[model samples]
Target chain A: SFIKALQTAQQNFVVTDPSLPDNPIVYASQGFLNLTGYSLDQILGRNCRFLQGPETDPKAVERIRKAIEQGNDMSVCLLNYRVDGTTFWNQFFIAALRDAGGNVTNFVGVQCKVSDQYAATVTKQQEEEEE
Target chain B: FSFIKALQTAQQNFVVTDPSLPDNPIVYASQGFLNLTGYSLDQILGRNCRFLQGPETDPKAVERIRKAIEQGNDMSVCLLNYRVDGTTFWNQFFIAALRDAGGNVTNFVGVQCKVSDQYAATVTKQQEEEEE
Candidate 1:
């Protein structure tokens, strides 16, 4: 029932099996499916990196990799592509989930779409500084 | 010892603003918030959170937040916010009114996080949805 709740959550939620090579997705929320315009069959068993594209930041990707390897929680924003090749900003956070034996069994990710207020602010600041 | 200390160590950033005060100056901010915004507590306190907003910030998003706050409702929004150094980051923020036992609004609590990469796509998506 709780899993069902997460599946229906308004924001994107994903669970991945760390034991699997490349950390394939075990569960994907409907919100995630809708956000990326991918069906569950298209997403399940795939690494989220499938969404990463040419514009995705390598630094952010490395940071996430490190966090995953170390079993630490991390947040990052990176560009991601939809199935149709359209781009969207992906604000992502991942936390490790441990089983009763204290061994990490899975990783949970929460994601959202952010607007470009940051770019606007920086450009405005840059202009002010230049002026 | 106090709740502030608990929040200070939290992974999530948080801020408290006195909406009843002029300009809704920030009354308190967590260390995590300081880290996220790259601002000293002194620099952030006594100022409205709007300093983090920028020229590209969506007016419609701002209006949505304003409407929610006016109605004492909980709201979450992801917007472009700037750091003290003027570099931009995606700020995912959740806001709720902190009310007294008498149900009087006292302050507003906001939890903030940098949800980076970029923001325009979401804005365009929102616009498209409204059109359809």
Candidate 2:
């Protein structure tokens, strides 16, 4: 039921279970697949990090790793590749879901196209870093 | 930016607004929306959607939107909206509140379409022609 409501909360988003080994994506919003141009089956069992490709920033990925490790909500902008081999800048936020006992259950991530929410200096840096 | 690449995806204009903020300011406005309203992200973010309303915008339509928002439900309406250039267009709008598991409003989703005006006009014109 939580997944049902969360998947409906926004167009593009995802839910990953840390309880699972390697923290693979457990649930995906329709828009997440829509944005990545992939089938649910393609991403269902894989780690979300597979979205990273050539130009993805290591610092951004590190920040995400840090957030998950810290069990805190955070925002990160990163370059991500689609199944089709094209990259898009994903503006992302993630927060952990906790059970009544305060045990972390899942991680919910919200996403938007970076072009939709670009920052001038950040965009400039990304562009300059692009090869 | 390539014509082929552009046409490959959904032609959608949407935004997510933060309800807890003072003005329910938009957190993200899609590129499609910026082009539709002729406003840059710098111009639209951190501001209420009311910026698009102008003299001709109907109070009744606005009230309907307000009611839906207050009730935390989904809503759809057609409204006359002004662009950054002060020109007007019919905006086909829809919005819904995103609720966290704790049942609190975390975000607001909004989408706009302008081409609906053309389709609305064509159907009515043909109806009038066939009537008299």
Candidate 3:
């Protein structure tokens, strides 16, 4: 159950502004405070990249690399390590930003947790139970 | 009449894929583009349409656009784009292939619109209200 995990992750995240790289920079919902174990000041000027480690998947990094080069919009899921080295799978949707002259600008991001393996096992048990 | 009317009434800037046709395209841009990007129709037309991406923008968004166009899939995504001045802006893009009378994709119409994340949450507002 993510009852505890949700509580932890929820306290620690913020939505960075897609526009104006710095203005109105941090979005800290009250739930974000309880999940990540950080104060608003600590979360500002930081990104989920702070959670990465050497063991993190390079494939995920490459995927992000191609998208930036081409300026195409994308969504992806990846596992990110917490400050303590524990990992969590994050489902993220990234959107392309544009400017007044119809040029490229910044990107907006949204992320959530996904319990894939556990969900599949639960689905199997449900099927067996129904059977 | 519906498409044309919708096209003109749109508050954001737009570019056409075929200059002769003026409407056939794989994507459409919303007003938000004008607020962030610095390009007008003169620069964007006949372009690859990925000019909005940058070093810090999301990589997944770029991949999706590439894969979809390569495989000719109808897909929509929200992404980050860069302005002429190197500032960042947010955009929500929807690209659906508009079929002809015979049901063939004569051309794809892309809709690139700007939306606040909070605004997008109401995506199905009309459908839910109709159901009620």
Candidate 4:
């Protein structure tokens, strides 16, 4: 019911099973598919790094990798591309979901589009410096 | 100098305002702000961000922000905000006064993010509870 509510609310989510090789996606919310314009069949078994594009920041990616390895809760905003190759700002949050025994079972990711809310403040400052 | 440079690649949106001025006009805005609001430099350069507020914006939330600014205290809030295109988005922003070496508040730095589904879910649950 919670997952359904998240889908109805248009929130993107992905669940990756840690037991699986490379932590393949076990479930992806309809909102996730709709946001990226990818079909369920295309995304179900793949790694989320597929969303990364040329503009995706390597530093952000590394931090996410570290978070996953350490099973830590983390959030980062990075560039991600859609199926149509259009780019959007992704405010990505990830947390490890544990079982009753506290064993990490899955990595739950909540990725939201927020580029419209962010600015490349650093780039502007650099250009301003050159002027 | 580093603070100015850090804004260049902050990845998140940030704004600095001259709080002493009328309307607290924005002095610096990141490129992310342009992308987020779809406003050009010419249009946003001299304006206060109040232009982004619409009819749906809660006056109570606005008042809270005003109080925080008056006291020069740090605050965080989620308010309904509008883009230049008139589309509404939930604005989750943090406001802090930047002080000079002499300890006087010289500017206000605001870091903002849009509300995510996680937040929307909580809001929905709270609204449902009150309705019940």
Which of the two, 1 or 3, has more DockQ? Answer: 1
Question: What tens-digit string does per-residue lDDT give for candidate 1 at A10-48?
Answer: 558899997888899988877888898999999899898
DockQ of each: 0.02, 0.02, 0.01, 0.02
Q: On a 0 to 1 TM-score scale, where does candidate 3 land against the true structure?
A: 0.40
Docking class of 3: incorrect
Which of the two, 3 or 4, has more DockQ?
Answer: 4
User: Model 4 chain A, poorest ten-residue lDDT window?
Assistant: A122-131
**Rank by TM-score, descending?**
1, 2, 4, 3
Q: Summarize candidate 1's per-residue lDDT along B1-132 as a digit string, tens digits.
A: 122334554545988889888878899888789988899998999998889888877666576568546645445555678888888876656676554433456787787766534343543354335435
Write candidate 3's Cα lDDT for A49-120 as tens digits: 664567655655565554444444444446666545677665444444444444445544444455766323
Candidate 1 Cα deviation (angstroms), residue A48: 0.8
TM-score of 1: 0.47
- lDDT of each candidate versus the true structure: 0.68, 0.69, 0.49, 0.68
lDDT (Cα, 0-100) at A121 in candidate 2: 32
lDDT of 3 by residue, B1-79 (tens): 2332355455434433432343333234445345557766555655656677888665765675555544333445556
Give TM-score values for chain A, per-prediction: 0.82, 0.84, 0.58, 0.83
Please report, as a residue range, the 10-residue window in candidate 3 chain A with the lowest summed lDDT.
Answer: A1-10
- What TM-score did chain B of candidate 1 earn? 0.83
Clashing pairs in 2: none
lDDT of 3 at B10: 51
